[PDB]
UniProtKB/Swiss-Prot annotation, chain A:
Organism: Homo sapiens
Similarity field: Belongs to the CSN7/EIF3M family. CSN7 subfamily.
Assembly, per entry: Component of the CSN complex, composed of COPS1/GPS1, COPS2, COPS3, COPS4, COPS5, COPS6, COPS7 (COPS7A or COPS7B), COPS8 and COPS9 isoform 1. In the complex, it probably interacts directly with COPS1, COPS2, COPS4, COPS5, COPS6 and COPS8. Interacts with EIF3S6. (Microbial infection) Interacts with vaccinia virus protein C9L.
Domain PCI positions: 1-123
Role noted for this protein: Component of the COP9 signalosome complex (CSN), a complex involved in various cellular and developmental processes. The CSN complex is an essential regulator of the ubiquitin (Ubl) conjugation pathway by mediating the deneddylation of the cullin subunits of SCF-type E3 ligase complexes, leading to decrease the Ubl ligase activity of SCF-type complexes such as SCF, CSA or DDB2. The complex is also involved in phosphorylation of p53/TP53, JUN, I-kappa-B-alpha/NFKBIA, ITPK1 and IRF8/ICSBP, possibly via its association with CK2 and PKD kinases.
Subcellular location: Cytoplasm; Nucleus
Organism superkingdom: Eukaryota
Lineage: Eukaryota, Metazoa, Chordata, Craniata, Vertebrata
Protein name per Swiss-Prot or TrEMBL: COP9 signalosome complex subunit 7b
From Swiss-Prot, chain B:
Protein name: COP9 signalosome complex subunit 4
Included range, full protein: 272 to 405 of 406
Record's function text: Component of the COP9 signalosome complex (CSN), a complex involved in various cellular and developmental processes. The CSN complex is an essential regulator of the ubiquitin (Ubl) conjugation pathway by mediating the deneddylation of the cullin subunits of SCF-type E3 ligase complexes, leading to decrease the Ubl ligase activity of SCF-type complexes such as SCF, CSA or DDB2. Also involved in the deneddylation of non-cullin subunits such as STON2.
Organism per entry: Homo sapiens (Human)
Subunit structure: Component of the CSN complex, composed of COPS1/GPS1, COPS2, COPS3, COPS4, COPS5, COPS6, COPS7 (COPS7A or COPS7B), COPS8 and COPS9 isoform 1. In the complex, it probably interacts directly with COPS1, COPS2, COPS3, COPS5, COPS6, COPS7 (COPS7A or COPS7B) and COPS8. Interacts with TOR1A; the interaction is direct and associates TOR1A and SNAPIN with the CSN complex. Interacts with STON2; controls STON2 neddylation levels. Interacts with ERCC6.
Family: Belongs to the CSN4 family.
Subcellular location: Cytoplasm; Nucleus; Cytoplasmic vesicle, Secretory vesicle, Synaptic vesicle
UniProtKB/Swiss-Prot annotation, chain C:
Protein's name in the database: COP9 signalosome complex subunit 2
Recorded name of the encoding gene: COPS2
Role, per record: Essential component of the COP9 signalosome complex (CSN), a complex involved in various cellular and developmental processes. The CSN complex is an essential regulator of the ubiquitin (Ubl) conjugation pathway by mediating the deneddylation of the cullin subunits of SCF-type E3 ligase complexes, leading to decrease the Ubl ligase activity of SCF-type complexes such as SCF, CSA or DDB2. The complex is also involved in phosphorylation of p53/TP53, c-jun/JUN, IkappaBalpha/NFKBIA, ITPK1 and IRF8/ICSBP, possibly via its association with CK2 and PKD kinases.
Protein location: Cytoplasm; Nucleus
Family indicated by similarity: Belongs to the CSN2 family.
Swiss-Prot record, chain D:
Source organism per UniProt: Homo sapiens (Human)
Gene: COPS5
Domain MPN, first and last residues per copy: 34-171
Further remark: The CSN complex is associated with some 'Lys-63'-specific deubiquitination. Such activity is however not mediated by the core CSN complex but by the BRCC3/BRCC36 component of the BRISC complex.
Keywords: Acetylation, Cytoplasm, Cytoplasmic vesicle, Hydrolase, Metal-binding, Metalloprotease, Nucleus, Protease, Signalosome, Synapse, Zinc
Self-association and partners: Component of the CSN complex, composed of COPS1/GPS1, COPS2, COPS3, COPS4, COPS5, COPS6, COPS7 (COPS7A or COPS7B), COPS8 and COPS9 isoform 1. In the complex, it probably interacts directly with COPS1, COPS2, COPS4, COPS6 and COPS7 (COPS7A or COPS7B) and COPS9 isoform 1. Interacts with COPS9 isoform 2. The CSN complex interacts with the BRISC complex. Also exists as monomeric form. Interacts with TP53, MIF, JUN, UCHL1, NCOA1, HIF1A, CDKN1B, BCL3, GFER, PGR, LHCGR, SMAD4, SMAD7, ID1, ID3, ITGB2 and TOP2A. Part of a complex consisting of RANBP9, Ran, DYRK1B and COPS5. Interacts with IFIT3.
Residue ranges of the motif JAMM motif: 117-130
Free-text comment about domains: The JAMM motif is essential for the protease activity of the CSN complex resulting in deneddylation of cullins. It constitutes the catalytic center of the complex.
Protein location: Cytoplasm, Cytosol; Nucleus; Cytoplasm, Perinuclear region; Cytoplasmic vesicle, Secretory vesicle, Synaptic vesicle
Enzyme class: hydrolase
Length: 123, 134, 55, 285, 98
């Protein structure tokens, strides 16, 4: 219930300001479904140019999971602690969608965690 | 679960007698917070080992078990302790009641989705109900 | 030691005590457990393993 | 239809024959079943709750078939009773005299069959005065039954809590669990087995107005809520079977009926579980 | 009667699910302007099935099935005992030999 307030002030901005707003959206807690924002023409037009990385990051945060940000981690902009935690939470949600009893090994492998305690803290 | 880092400011404003220790080096604040963390973890865990229970409570291995057993025998929390395996069990779900709860949640989700559809496109919902009844 | 347990009425009946209170402590201690080590009970109750087993 | 449309068809020839034969004069343990209609039950409950903690009471209409008392309607007497005692001094009698005639005018062919009375907070039983009144009514109006309904217990427990009783005649000479549930006169009366019935149109409109509790039935999941009730029925049925085999040397038929009822309810619960598993667990692999 | 009572509720559940499915199908191509929120909730509803497909549930379910089966076996034995009692009684009153 917080993406609409970002969309309201995101309907006119474009360019570097739009990518900064996208990063702020991915950073803001409580936002986990970036679908309505992804439908805007300003965001979709970012494919052509040097800002396609931000569109790829938004697509990853909307449909992709954390392992998807493993092969192309360097290509995409570096994610802060909040963005990485949000991506890990979305990966947990995706895993829970397909299975209602997620083994710890699957979570450790997909979220790239070397400690059981930190994985449980994240969960 | 309340970590200690957000309680340093709170400990400063406590009146002096509330800052007294309990003859073991831990004051009143970081014993009430320990009990609160353990009670709140009883809700997030089906069961937990002593080492892990003390890892997130900063109490090393043994006083974690002592406090866990003290919160029981008083009715403050539910659960039992297997000391051989070193595991505290908080709440066990008996499968069939869980199945009942999940079925009820599924039906509630269906009802909420239908209410959302009706409140979003009332004309379409009316025409669809009319077509369905025929 | 030389104040209460000198007359033959408290000194005779003190052995019943230190056993009822030990029993109550044992009951309270094993309430939340399903499996408990006997040496753990011996450490908690200050009595040795054989006395813990007998109790 | 047809067969389930019965019990509402009232004939006077059979009623006259059973009232003239008077078979209850010989066998004092005659009536064992009380078949109450849904309308009578609902009216009794609403009247009992209307009086709050004050006792209220009224009459019944119905008939007799064999060893069964059929209740088809309920009254509402204009009685102003205290919190533990109802009297019906002078207005209730004229009211019940006029109501029968008024019902005769519109087509109610059922005659008076008994009286129902509210026990606001003290269970369902017959006290000394209840026993006296019911035995007088039986001695002068032989087909009769006394029903007692607890409004407060019904509302608190969420279940209908009422009973039907018939007194023994004075001089009827022939354990510890019948002294707290009932009164000191517990041996002066007996409890008829109470069953409820409804009609085809009533159930039609009831199922028609059943559109909000489908979630409750789709996850009702008996065999867990009625596990204690089922094992109670089973260990009572074992004693019933012991009595039946002692008789063997028809109690066995009644024991078999009870076993069939308990087993059928258990299999109904299992059928609900199987249907739920087919509905919710055999989809999406 | 019990199966008709179950039927009355399964019909309502089927009606609701069919209405949701029709809404999804309509919002798919061009019929109704789709809501992202409603479509995501429908995806969650689809992800909610199967309900409790764990091995632990599959053991308790067969426990219940076997308990009800044993109760049914005992009830059947009781009914057959009553029937054989009646048959023995009639055989004794017809072929009464002293």
């Amino acid at each position: 219930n917080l993406l609409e307030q970002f969309i309201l002030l995101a309907k006119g901005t474009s360019g570097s300001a739009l990518t900064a707003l996208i990063s702020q959206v991915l950073e803001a807690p409580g936002v986990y479904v970036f679908g309505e924002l992804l439908e805007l023409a300003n965001v979709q037009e970012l494919a052509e140019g040097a800002n396609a990385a931000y569109l790829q990051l938004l697509n990853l945060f909307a449909y992709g999971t954390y392992p998807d940000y493993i092969a192309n981690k360097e290509s995409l902009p570096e994610l802060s602690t909040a963005q990485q935690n949000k991506l890990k939470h979305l990966t947990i949600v995706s895993l829970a969608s397909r299975m209602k009893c997620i083994p710890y090994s699957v979570l450790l492998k997909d979220l790239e965690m070397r400690n059981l305690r930190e994985l449980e803290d994240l969960i | 679960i309340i970590r200690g880092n957000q309680l340093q400011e709170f400990a400063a404003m406590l009146m002096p007698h509330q800052k007294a220790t309990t003859a073991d080096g831990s004051s009143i604040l970081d014993r009430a917070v320990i009990e609160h963390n353990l009670l709140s973890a009883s809700k997030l865990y089906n069961n937990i080992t002593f080492e892990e229970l003390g890892a997130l409570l900063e109490i090393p291995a043994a006083k974690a078990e002592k406090i866990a057993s003290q919160m029981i025998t008083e009715g403050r929390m539910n659960g039992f302790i297997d000391q051989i395996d070193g595991i505290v069990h908080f709440e066990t779900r008996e499968a069939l009641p869980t199945w009942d709860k999940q079925i009820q949640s599924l039906c509630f989700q269906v009802n909420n989705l239908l209410e959302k559809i009706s409140q979003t496109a009332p004309e379409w919902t009316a025409q669809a109900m009319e077509a369905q009844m025929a | 030691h030389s104040n209460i347990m000198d007359d033959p009425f408290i000194r005779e009946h003190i052995e019943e005590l230190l056993r009822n209170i030990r029993t109550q402590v044992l009951i309270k201690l094993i309430k939340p457990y399903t499996r408990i080590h006997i040496p753990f009970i011996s450490k908690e109750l200050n009595i040795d393993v054989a006395d813990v087993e007998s109790l | 239809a047809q067969s389930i449309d019965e019990i509402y068809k009232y004939d006077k020839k059979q009623q006259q024959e059973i009232l003239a034969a008077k078979p209850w004069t010989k066998d004092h343990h005659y009536f064992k079943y009380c078949k109450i209609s849904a309308l009578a039950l609902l009216k009794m409950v609403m009247h009992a709750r209307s009086g709050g903690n004050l006792a209220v009471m009224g009459l019944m209409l119905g008939k007799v078939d064999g060893e069964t008392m059929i209740i088809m309607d309920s009254f509402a007497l204009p009685v102003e009773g205290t919190e533990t005692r109802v009297n019906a001094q002078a207005a209730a009698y004229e009211y019940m005299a006029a109501y029968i005639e008024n019902a005769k005018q519109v087509g109610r062919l059922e005659n008076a069959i008994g009286w129902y009375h509210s026990h606001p907070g003290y269970g369902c039983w017959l006290s000394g005065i209840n026993v006296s009144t019911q035995m007088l009514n039986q001695q002068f109006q032989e087909p009769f039954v006394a029903v007692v309904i607890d409004p407060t217990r019904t509302i608190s427990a969420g279940k209908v809590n009422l009973g039907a009783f018939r007194t023994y005649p004075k001089g009827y000479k022939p354990p510890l669990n019948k002294i707290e549930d009932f009164g000191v006169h517990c041996k002066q009366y007996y409890a008829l087995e109470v069953s409820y019935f409804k009609s085809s149109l009533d159930r039609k409109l009831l199922e028609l107005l059943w559109n909000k509790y489908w979630v409750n039935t789709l996850s009702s999941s008996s065999l867990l809520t009625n596990a204690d009730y089922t094992t109670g029925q089973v260990f009572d049925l074992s004693e019933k079977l012991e009595q039946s085999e002692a008789q063997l040397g028809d109690k066995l038929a009644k024991a078999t009926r009870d076993s069939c009822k308990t087993t059928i309810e258990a299999i109904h619960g299992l059928m609900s579980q199987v249907i739920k598993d087919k509905l919710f667990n055999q989809i999406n692999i | 009667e019990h199966l008709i009572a179950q039927h009355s509720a399964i019909k309502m559940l089927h009606s609701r699910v069919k209405l949701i499915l029709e809404y999804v199908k309509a919002s798919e191509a061009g019929e109704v302007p789709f809501n992202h929120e409603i479509l995501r909730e429908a995806y969650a509803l689809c992800h909610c099935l199967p309900v409790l497909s764990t091995d632990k549930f599959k053991t308790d379910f067969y426990d219940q099935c076997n308990d009800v089966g044993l109760m049914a076996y005992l009830g059947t034995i009781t009914k057959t005992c009553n029937t054989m009692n009646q048959f023995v009684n009639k055989f004794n009153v017809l072929y009464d030999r002293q």
